[PDB]
RNA sequence: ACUCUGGUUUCUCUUCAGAUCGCAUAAAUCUUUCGCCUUUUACUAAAGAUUUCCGUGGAGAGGAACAACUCUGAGUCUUAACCCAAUUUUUUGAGGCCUUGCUUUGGCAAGGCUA
């Protein structure tokens, strides 16, 4: 059947030694900060795509959130932008830096 | 095995002990042993008639000692 | 008992291995569904690369994330092994032969 | 060697006669190597053991509850009844 | 299982304890291990930990605990019977630590956790300092002990030295925070428990001694623990703890007899299956089945450590040794939390923790039901026993004996005091035990005290809850469409009750502003609001930082305002506060309720203020904690001293109102030494109109602030960014871009990592952690907590160039545009008028 | 580690009574319970065999002169 | 240390899918929008809902092959040289008397004397 394998620790040691060439040295999931599947999911669920992430065709037209009219508080005359609100900010905290987040996914914070 | 009794809080305190045969002693505990044999400094044994006789520092064994109660605040 | 043995370093290194080598013993996987390059594009970026490499990585990440999105099997099959039934059919028989012979047989059959 | 005599009578209501002469009837649920027994819902009587008493079967009986009898003051024990469901 | 309710009756068998953690993963792992030990039904999966303390789905998906979980059970002990431990696991985030502040009043003992590899952290240090200021017992737990054993693979002697260094640093921090003689913490003293929280490996010196006694011999475990804990060394020839260290090549007792067996077991398990051979297992006195051996390395190690190291009896023994019973520990809690004083008869009875006395339960935690429609108020019952259906008066945090209308009567339904199974079978709960009162949620927002209706007519609620962190990040909330505006508002109320740190304010500009401490905090707030408390989609604004207004120079000319009644005019001059006074007053060092002589002595000794100035009427902002202080320097030669005494309350009200609402941006003002120069007013009570003073007082405050040099102030956030050495310089580059200043930088003792303490302005702090983590390619990690107000560059009212709508302003121009934008957003007049 | 000694050690802190071999019954809060049944209590009430009752602020009775002990019903569950 | 305990490889057959069926990933049809647009083959690209398709697990059944080797838990479940009791039983100094009150007698509770 050749379906299940029960092996020993030294065999893993030597196989890992041999396969170091094809395997990256990353060991902590924090390296996949904004490249885990959930970050790409919440990027696809929005128009904004992270620079390292691919672009996507929006699920719907979303004309409501495309170009909203100026409001009493939405006016840029009052909003102060010390730093640009990049796509990293929106993907990191989709429920804060994104008006009408709607159907999004949740990303792991830290390891 | 061979744990000693918790008599550190009652060390140097005036207490009354009951010894076998209906005996009553009162004095300051001068120490304790692993078998519960303690030293009573300035012990005064109270007789059955009511009179008390001071015997000084003596050694009370825990085999004939029924129970001790401290006369001061623990 | 030796506090430090020769196999301590190997085991403690394996304890932080990637997914395939972290498991002491498990079940097999097929040859075609073991993506070696999978861990490559999942990294942040192959830094120091031409623009075309970036575009290829982004597009393949898009394909991977689209594959990851729609993944639900309703297939509560009856385990009807059609291939095994065809093997059991009297119109076909079983034998053993080299792979290259089977390949030339299939080429002739396709012709 | 086996020691199955002490675990078979455990959890049942037994009446044990102590060294002082009192009869304690209680649910013997725990024992020890020094013969110290634990009787849950124990009642100690010193008048007589009521076994078909026409005039009276309970005289000088005091129910204490969860009692711990030492093995140095215990003499013998007899089975009285099985334990309840609760 | 009725013994769980039976043990609740015994007031001396309860151990009210709250947990703390560097990261919520470590503390919750320990809580899950405790639950698994207590509850055999729940077993953690091999792939991921159960994490029973992460009730919310947001915490489960994000990985960081959101709300504190007060769940625990009856647990046994090595030398003692089972005690009903109740533990409120707290989140491991700097901002979320504000929630842990509530636990500060839930229990009187903090079982702090410190990671072995990570060591001391900013969150851990802040929690330790806050607990020391909260007068609670501290029992440290070396967490993730396997990290030093496995992850770092450090030598056993080096690992012991690192652990000793961590313990010494903790002891030094505790001694700096508090001067009590009980600050000594060590395994010999019993204040340190080595609990990796992974593989179920927890113990103390006493636990190891008990294991040794069980294995062979009859050695007294207490003496062995007292001897082997430190570096007293062991002599084999003398075969005793020999402090002189006679043997040349011997290892310390803890290293030789405690750390070494754990290292050997870990090496045998991880090294190979033949390394952890059945012969080695038999030598360790364990016979695992073939199925357990066939498991992977991590499950095998977990099973081996769990079977070998008992059932966490050492932690229970350590808690029982130091964390007191509620009967013993209620008196210090009565002294601290209660604002009515322990000398009160009801207070004295509560200090004795009498179940049959008056009912005095303080509820501060708020928990949403599964449906989310109703809430439940979680709190300790200091005195009395609450019964289902019994009416009770729930005096709020703002309740006072002046007005009885501040409290309302309500009925208490099912109690659901037991939380381990989250069941509501509890009928009544005695004093000293945590109760989840149901049905009284509506009258109370947060931190309110329930009491018996008619038994007591003078008992008052405890002191209002205080937090170390300060909410400085403000965000606006609007609905997508106003048609269902109230529904969202309903959820907003559900937000205010659920999160004590979050502050919901209805601004005069018709905007609902939520104030929180951290970006992740407000993100979790909005997630809970949208998903649970208000299903309506909510539009937001860009995060803004609450700003402060300060002075740098004394007022040029006096400012006077005249009351309408017969022109009664008060004149004053404002001056900048003395350097260093703001944080001293804000740290509750000196209160307005202090005696005049004591305050005068303090000011003459520390700040060398004039005795006459100290004897003046002192305001010190709202609740005597506002850095903006007010001194009534009116000359006694004037006949207005009697009038000032008759108008002291009005003057104080005007000053506190002006402190709450300043002239620029109407925000909080700090470090202003408002000197009441003089006041001329008719002695007739008719001319002393109450409503004619406070507006005049705030007008005088505004004019004096304008007369003095005005400056803007931004909250500089302390950030303890931990990062690998190579990226350390690059980390500074991040602070270079976000206008950050590096305060200190030190390598982590015993770890390749490197900590950097920096002071990032709040304006650029939004997303700073994201920039640091992405730029360092997911290696560096940061955690920012508000540290101190720092004066912003520029002048708020100086005529400067108007900035572009979408371009950062130059540094000298920041203050003016901040002021104009804040004034316009608040809804007040944008232009600042010198006449006004 | 005995079951009765473990039940006596777990019953410390609650109200329980103990009848000694001399007939003196002392009822009170068990402050400390030893391994050999030595019980130290505080604020107990001792009644002798003659009927005289008294109150003791703190006492410590050894197990050698103790006959039996009755604990509360909360330890049964 | 004693009695029962009893296979795993396999081949197929019939069911049910919980479980990232699978730590991999296609295709077809239909449906709504987007580029649409020149008719279908088609597309572009996403969503929605099916289906086939490569595979897999659980569970059950029937033959072959190691079926006699048991694995294993359960079944209280098996021993002496020389030293031992001031708290839990093969060393324990807890022994005697009179009076008072109750009970029809028998017996029960208290005090002292003692060596």
PDB file of N, CA, C and O in Angstrom, chain E residues 650-702:
ATOM      1  N   UNK E 650     -17.600  78.283  43.309  1.00  0.00           N
ATOM      2  CA  UNK E 650     -17.835  78.741  41.944  1.00  0.00           C
ATOM      3  C   UNK E 650     -16.525  78.900  41.182  1.00  0.00           C
ATOM      4  O   UNK E 650     -16.438  78.545  40.002  1.00  0.00           O
ATOM      5  N   UNK E 651     -15.497  79.437  41.842  1.00  0.00           N
ATOM      6  CA  UNK E 651     -14.198  79.598  41.196  1.00  0.00           C
ATOM      7  C   UNK E 651     -13.610  78.240  40.832  1.00  0.00           C
ATOM      8  O   UNK E 651     -13.045  78.063  39.747  1.00  0.00           O
ATOM      9  N   UNK E 652     -13.730  77.264  41.734  1.00  0.00           N
ATOM     10  CA  UNK E 652     -13.208  75.928  41.462  1.00  0.00           C
ATOM     11  C   UNK E 652     -13.961  75.282  40.307  1.00  0.00           C
ATOM     12  O   UNK E 652     -13.361  74.623  39.447  1.00  0.00           O
ATOM     13  N   UNK E 653     -15.286  75.444  40.274  1.00  0.00           N
ATOM     14  CA  UNK E 653     -16.069  74.897  39.170  1.00  0.00           C
ATOM     15  C   UNK E 653     -15.674  75.539  37.846  1.00  0.00           C
ATOM     16  O   UNK E 653     -15.523  74.849  36.831  1.00  0.00           O
ATOM     17  N   UNK E 654     -15.492  76.860  37.841  1.00  0.00           N
ATOM     18  CA  UNK E 654     -15.047  77.527  36.629  1.00  0.00           C
ATOM     19  C   UNK E 654     -13.679  77.054  36.178  1.00  0.00           C
ATOM     20  O   UNK E 654     -13.450  76.838  34.985  1.00  0.00           O
ATOM     21  N   UNK E 655     -12.756  76.876  37.126  1.00  0.00           N
ATOM     22  CA  UNK E 655     -11.421  76.411  36.770  1.00  0.00           C
ATOM     23  C   UNK E 655     -11.448  74.998  36.205  1.00  0.00           C
ATOM     24  O   UNK E 655     -10.764  74.709  35.218  1.00  0.00           O
ATOM     25  N   UNK E 656     -12.213  74.096  36.822  1.00  0.00           N
ATOM     26  CA  UNK E 656     -12.263  72.731  36.306  1.00  0.00           C
ATOM     27  C   UNK E 656     -12.947  72.684  34.944  1.00  0.00           C
ATOM     28  O   UNK E 656     -12.534  71.920  34.061  1.00  0.00           O
ATOM     29  N   UNK E 657     -13.977  73.511  34.741  1.00  0.00           N
ATOM     30  CA  UNK E 657     -14.607  73.588  33.427  1.00  0.00           C
ATOM     31  C   UNK E 657     -13.629  74.097  32.376  1.00  0.00           C
ATOM     32  O   UNK E 657     -13.567  73.561  31.264  1.00  0.00           O
ATOM     33  N   UNK E 658     -12.854  75.131  32.711  1.00  0.00           N
ATOM     34  CA  UNK E 658     -11.858  75.627  31.776  1.00  0.00           C
ATOM     35  C   UNK E 658     -10.763  74.615  31.500  1.00  0.00           C
ATOM     36  O   UNK E 658     -10.238  74.541  30.387  1.00  0.00           O
ATOM     37  N   UNK E 659     -10.395  73.832  32.515  1.00  0.00           N
ATOM     38  CA  UNK E 659      -9.410  72.776  32.316  1.00  0.00           C
ATOM     39  C   UNK E 659      -9.935  71.708  31.365  1.00  0.00           C
ATOM     40  O   UNK E 659      -9.200  71.218  30.500  1.00  0.00           O
ATOM     41  N   UNK E 660     -11.207  71.335  31.514  1.00  0.00           N
ATOM     42  CA  UNK E 660     -11.789  70.342  30.616  1.00  0.00           C
ATOM     43  C   UNK E 660     -11.926  70.886  29.198  1.00  0.00           C
ATOM     44  O   UNK E 660     -11.687  70.161  28.225  1.00  0.00           O
ATOM     45  N   UNK E 661     -12.306  72.156  29.057  1.00  0.00           N
ATOM     46  CA  UNK E 661     -12.494  72.781  27.749  1.00  0.00           C
ATOM     47  C   UNK E 661     -11.648  74.045  27.684  1.00  0.00           C
ATOM     48  O   UNK E 661     -12.002  75.063  28.288  1.00  0.00           O
ATOM     49  N   UNK E 662     -10.542  73.985  26.944  1.00  0.00           N
ATOM     50  CA  UNK E 662      -9.634  75.100  26.829  1.00  0.00           C
ATOM     51  C   UNK E 662     -10.034  76.078  25.743  1.00  0.00           C
ATOM     52  O   UNK E 662     -11.068  75.926  25.087  1.00  0.00           O
ATOM     53  N   UNK E 663      -9.217  77.115  25.540  1.00  0.00           N
ATOM     54  CA  UNK E 663      -9.536  78.089  24.486  1.00  0.00           C
ATOM     55  C   UNK E 663      -9.214  77.590  23.090  1.00  0.00           C
ATOM     56  O   UNK E 663      -9.927  77.936  22.141  1.00  0.00           O
ATOM     57  N   UNK E 664      -8.163  76.789  22.935  1.00  0.00           N
ATOM     58  CA  UNK E 664      -7.774  76.246  21.642  1.00  0.00           C
ATOM     59  C   UNK E 664      -8.182  74.781  21.581  1.00  0.00           C
ATOM     60  O   UNK E 664      -7.765  73.982  22.429  1.00  0.00           O
ATOM     61  N   UNK E 665      -9.018  74.443  20.597  1.00  0.00           N
ATOM     62  CA  UNK E 665      -9.489  73.079  20.360  1.00  0.00           C
ATOM     63  C   UNK E 665     -10.352  72.560  21.507  1.00  0.00           C
ATOM     64  O   UNK E 665     -10.815  71.416  21.464  1.00  0.00           O
ATOM     65  N   UNK E 666     -10.571  73.391  22.529  1.00  0.00           N
ATOM     66  CA  UNK E 666     -11.413  73.047  23.678  1.00  0.00           C
ATOM     67  C   UNK E 666     -11.010  71.713  24.305  1.00  0.00           C
ATOM     68  O   UNK E 666     -11.834  71.011  24.893  1.00  0.00           O
ATOM     69  N   UNK E 667      -9.734  71.355  24.184  1.00  0.00           N
ATOM     70  CA  UNK E 667      -9.243  70.090  24.701  1.00  0.00           C
ATOM     71  C   UNK E 667      -8.681  70.278  26.108  1.00  0.00           C
ATOM     72  O   UNK E 667      -8.781  71.349  26.711  1.00  0.00           O
ATOM     73  N   UNK E 668      -8.082  69.216  26.641  1.00  0.00           N
ATOM     74  CA  UNK E 668      -7.501  69.273  27.973  1.00  0.00           C
ATOM     75  C   UNK E 668      -6.268  70.166  27.985  1.00  0.00           C
ATOM     76  O   UNK E 668      -5.481  70.185  27.034  1.00  0.00           O
ATOM     77  N   UNK E 669      -6.102  70.915  29.073  1.00  0.00           N
ATOM     78  CA  UNK E 669      -4.956  71.793  29.266  1.00  0.00           C
ATOM     79  C   UNK E 669      -4.213  71.343  30.517  1.00  0.00           C
ATOM     80  O   UNK E 669      -4.830  71.024  31.539  1.00  0.00           O
ATOM     81  N   UNK E 670      -2.887  71.294  30.425  1.00  0.00           N
ATOM     82  CA  UNK E 670      -2.053  70.762  31.490  1.00  0.00           C
ATOM     83  C   UNK E 670      -0.883  71.697  31.757  1.00  0.00           C
ATOM     84  O   UNK E 670      -0.491  72.497  30.904  1.00  0.00           O
ATOM     85  N   UNK E 671      -0.332  71.583  32.969  1.00  0.00           N
ATOM     86  CA  UNK E 671       0.853  72.335  33.382  1.00  0.00           C
ATOM     87  C   UNK E 671       0.638  73.843  33.270  1.00  0.00           C
ATOM     88  O   UNK E 671       1.487  74.573  32.757  1.00  0.00           O
ATOM     89  N   UNK E 672      -0.509  74.314  33.752  1.00  0.00           N
ATOM     90  CA  UNK E 672      -0.829  75.736  33.789  1.00  0.00           C
ATOM     91  C   UNK E 672      -1.027  76.133  35.245  1.00  0.00           C
ATOM     92  O   UNK E 672      -1.912  75.598  35.924  1.00  0.00           O
ATOM     93  N   UNK E 673      -0.205  77.066  35.726  1.00  0.00           N
ATOM     94  CA  UNK E 673      -0.296  77.539  37.107  1.00  0.00           C
ATOM     95  C   UNK E 673      -1.158  78.799  37.132  1.00  0.00           C
ATOM     96  O   UNK E 673      -0.672  79.930  37.204  1.00  0.00           O
ATOM     97  N   UNK E 674      -2.470  78.587  37.065  1.00  0.00           N
ATOM     98  CA  UNK E 674      -3.418  79.694  37.057  1.00  0.00           C
ATOM     99  C   UNK E 674      -3.424  80.389  38.412  1.00  0.00           C
ATOM    100  O   UNK E 674      -3.866  79.817  39.414  1.00  0.00           O
ATOM    101  N   UNK E 675      -2.947  81.629  38.439  1.00  0.00           N
ATOM    102  CA  UNK E 675      -2.874  82.425  39.656  1.00  0.00           C
ATOM    103  C   UNK E 675      -4.032  83.413  39.668  1.00  0.00           C
ATOM    104  O   UNK E 675      -4.096  84.309  38.819  1.00  0.00           O
ATOM    105  N   UNK E 676      -4.941  83.249  40.628  1.00  0.00           N
ATOM    106  CA  UNK E 676      -6.094  84.137  40.770  1.00  0.00           C
ATOM    107  C   UNK E 676      -5.587  85.434  41.396  1.00  0.00           C
ATOM    108  O   UNK E 676      -5.374  85.508  42.608  1.00  0.00           O
ATOM    109  N   UNK E 677      -5.393  86.463  40.568  1.00  0.00           N
ATOM    110  CA  UNK E 677      -4.757  87.689  41.040  1.00  0.00           C
ATOM    111  C   UNK E 677      -5.605  88.388  42.098  1.00  0.00           C
ATOM    112  O   UNK E 677      -5.123  88.682  43.198  1.00  0.00           O
ATOM    113  N   UNK E 678      -6.875  88.647  41.791  1.00  0.00           N
ATOM    114  CA  UNK E 678      -7.748  89.370  42.708  1.00  0.00           C
ATOM    115  C   UNK E 678      -9.172  89.313  42.173  1.00  0.00           C
ATOM    116  O   UNK E 678      -9.423  88.849  41.058  1.00  0.00           O
ATOM    117  N   UNK E 679     -10.106  89.809  42.984  1.00  0.00           N
ATOM    118  CA  UNK E 679     -11.506  89.876  42.585  1.00  0.00           C
ATOM    119  C   UNK E 679     -12.208  90.922  43.434  1.00  0.00           C
ATOM    120  O   UNK E 679     -12.060  90.927  44.660  1.00  0.00           O
ATOM    121  N   UNK E 680     -12.964  91.803  42.786  1.00  0.00           N
ATOM    122  CA  UNK E 680     -13.786  92.800  43.458  1.00  0.00           C
ATOM    123  C   UNK E 680     -15.240  92.471  43.154  1.00  0.00           C
ATOM    124  O   UNK E 680     -15.646  92.434  41.984  1.00  0.00           O
ATOM    125  N   UNK E 681     -16.018  92.225  44.203  1.00  0.00           N
ATOM    126  CA  UNK E 681     -17.410  91.812  44.060  1.00  0.00           C
ATOM    127  C   UNK E 681     -18.200  92.362  45.236  1.00  0.00           C
ATOM    128  O   UNK E 681     -17.697  92.439  46.359  1.00  0.00           O
ATOM    129  N   UNK E 682     -19.444  92.751  44.969  1.00  0.00           N
ATOM    130  CA  UNK E 682     -20.321  93.224  46.027  1.00  0.00           C
ATOM    131  C   UNK E 682     -20.655  92.088  46.986  1.00  0.00           C
ATOM    132  O   UNK E 682     -20.940  90.963  46.569  1.00  0.00           O
ATOM    133  N   UNK E 683     -20.617  92.391  48.285  1.00  0.00           N
ATOM    134  CA  UNK E 683     -20.877  91.383  49.305  1.00  0.00           C
ATOM    135  C   UNK E 683     -22.330  90.927  49.334  1.00  0.00           C
ATOM    136  O   UNK E 683     -22.633  89.932  50.000  1.00  0.00           O
ATOM    137  N   UNK E 684     -23.225  91.622  48.641  1.00  0.00           N
ATOM    138  CA  UNK E 684     -24.631  91.239  48.639  1.00  0.00           C
ATOM    139  C   UNK E 684     -24.803  89.883  47.964  1.00  0.00           C
ATOM    140  O   UNK E 684     -24.288  89.678  46.857  1.00  0.00           O
ATOM    141  N   UNK E 685     -25.502  88.934  48.594  1.00  0.00           N
ATOM    142  CA  UNK E 685     -25.705  87.625  47.951  1.00  0.00           C
ATOM    143  C   UNK E 685     -26.443  87.709  46.626  1.00  0.00           C
ATOM    144  O   UNK E 685     -26.234  86.851  45.759  1.00  0.00           O
ATOM    145  N   UNK E 686     -27.306  88.712  46.448  1.00  0.00           N
ATOM    146  CA  UNK E 686     -28.018  88.859  45.182  1.00  0.00           C
ATOM    147  C   UNK E 686     -27.051  89.111  44.033  1.00  0.00           C
ATOM    148  O   UNK E 686     -27.215  88.557  42.939  1.00  0.00           O
ATOM    149  N   UNK E 687     -26.035  89.945  44.261  1.00  0.00           N
ATOM    150  CA  UNK E 687     -25.019  90.192  43.246  1.00  0.00           C
ATOM    151  C   UNK E 687     -24.113  88.991  43.014  1.00  0.00           C
ATOM    152  O   UNK E 687     -23.394  88.964  42.009  1.00  0.00           O
ATOM    153  N   UNK E 688     -24.126  88.006  43.910  1.00  0.00           N
ATOM    154  CA  UNK E 688     -23.278  86.821  43.778  1.00  0.00           C
ATOM    155  C   UNK E 688     -24.019  85.710  43.031  1.00  0.00           C
ATOM    156  O   UNK E 688     -24.261  84.619  43.547  1.00  0.00           O
ATOM    157  N   UNK E 689     -24.384  86.015  41.789  1.00  0.00           N
ATOM    158  CA  UNK E 689     -25.053  85.050  40.939  1.00  0.00           C
ATOM    159  C   UNK E 689     -24.189  83.848  40.623  1.00  0.00           C
ATOM    160  O   UNK E 689     -23.059  83.997  40.150  1.00  0.00           O
ATOM    161  N   UNK E 690     -24.712  82.648  40.881  1.00  0.00           N
ATOM    162  CA  UNK E 690     -23.928  81.444  40.656  1.00  0.00           C
ATOM    163  C   UNK E 690     -23.557  81.246  39.199  1.00  0.00           C
ATOM    164  O   UNK E 690     -22.441  80.825  38.883  1.00  0.00           O
ATOM    165  N   UNK E 691     -24.483  81.543  38.293  1.00  0.00           N
ATOM    166  CA  UNK E 691     -24.231  81.397  36.875  1.00  0.00           C
ATOM    167  C   UNK E 691     -23.428  82.506  36.240  1.00  0.00           C
ATOM    168  O   UNK E 691     -23.106  82.420  35.052  1.00  0.00           O
ATOM    169  N   UNK E 692     -23.103  83.556  36.989  1.00  0.00           N
ATOM    170  CA  UNK E 692     -22.326  84.671  36.469  1.00  0.00           C
ATOM    171  C   UNK E 692     -20.827  84.515  36.686  1.00  0.00           C
ATOM    172  O   UNK E 692     -20.055  85.331  36.172  1.00  0.00           O
ATOM    173  N   UNK E 693     -20.399  83.498  37.426  1.00  0.00           N
ATOM    174  CA  UNK E 693     -18.994  83.319  37.773  1.00  0.00           C
ATOM    175  C   UNK E 693     -18.309  82.319  36.853  1.00  0.00           C
ATOM    176  O   UNK E 693     -17.247  82.603  36.299  1.00  0.00           O
ATOM    177  N   UNK E 694     -18.903  81.133  36.684  1.00  0.00           N
ATOM    178  CA  UNK E 694     -18.252  80.083  35.898  1.00  0.00           C
ATOM    179  C   UNK E 694     -17.992  80.512  34.458  1.00  0.00           C
ATOM    180  O   UNK E 694     -16.871  80.295  33.966  1.00  0.00           O
ATOM    181  N   UNK E 695     -18.952  81.093  33.724  1.00  0.00           N
ATOM    182  CA  UNK E 695     -18.600  81.630  32.397  1.00  0.00           C
ATOM    183  C   UNK E 695     -17.527  82.701  32.458  1.00  0.00           C
ATOM    184  O   UNK E 695     -16.615  82.711  31.622  1.00  0.00           O
ATOM    185  N   UNK E 696     -17.603  83.600  33.442  1.00  0.00           N
ATOM    186  CA  UNK E 696     -16.561  84.606  33.607  1.00  0.00           C
ATOM    187  C   UNK E 696     -15.227  83.957  33.948  1.00  0.00           C
ATOM    188  O   UNK E 696     -14.175  84.388  33.462  1.00  0.00           O
ATOM    189  N   UNK E 697     -15.253  82.915  34.784  1.00  0.00           N
ATOM    190  CA  UNK E 697     -14.021  82.220  35.138  1.00  0.00           C
ATOM    191  C   UNK E 697     -13.376  81.577  33.916  1.00  0.00           C
ATOM    192  O   UNK E 697     -12.159  81.678  33.721  1.00  0.00           O
ATOM    193  N   UNK E 698     -14.177  80.918  33.073  1.00  0.00           N
ATOM    194  CA  UNK E 698     -13.598  80.284  31.893  1.00  0.00           C
ATOM    195  C   UNK E 698     -13.150  81.319  30.866  1.00  0.00           C
ATOM    196  O   UNK E 698     -12.162  81.094  30.160  1.00  0.00           O
ATOM    197  N   UNK E 699     -13.841  82.459  30.780  1.00  0.00           N
ATOM    198  CA  UNK E 699     -13.371  83.538  29.917  1.00  0.00           C
ATOM    199  C   UNK E 699     -12.027  84.072  30.397  1.00  0.00           C
ATOM    200  O   UNK E 699     -11.130  84.338  29.587  1.00  0.00           O
ATOM    201  N   UNK E 700     -11.874  84.236  31.713  1.00  0.00           N
ATOM    202  CA  UNK E 700     -10.591  84.652  32.272  1.00  0.00           C
ATOM    203  C   UNK E 700      -9.518  83.618  31.963  1.00  0.00           C
ATOM    204  O   UNK E 700      -8.381  83.964  31.627  1.00  0.00           O
ATOM    205  N   UNK E 701      -9.860  82.333  32.073  1.00  0.00           N
ATOM    206  CA  UNK E 701      -8.896  81.276  31.778  1.00  0.00           C
ATOM    207  C   UNK E 701      -8.450  81.355  30.323  1.00  0.00           C
ATOM    208  O   UNK E 701      -7.253  81.272  30.015  1.00  0.00           O
ATOM    209  N   UNK E 702      -9.406  81.521  29.405  1.00  0.00           N
ATOM    210  CA  UNK E 702      -9.068  81.607  27.987  1.00  0.00           C
ATOM    211  C   UNK E 702      -8.199  82.825  27.702  1.00  0.00           C
ATOM    212  O   UNK E 702      -7.211  82.733  26.962  1.00  0.00           O
TER     213      UNK E 702
END
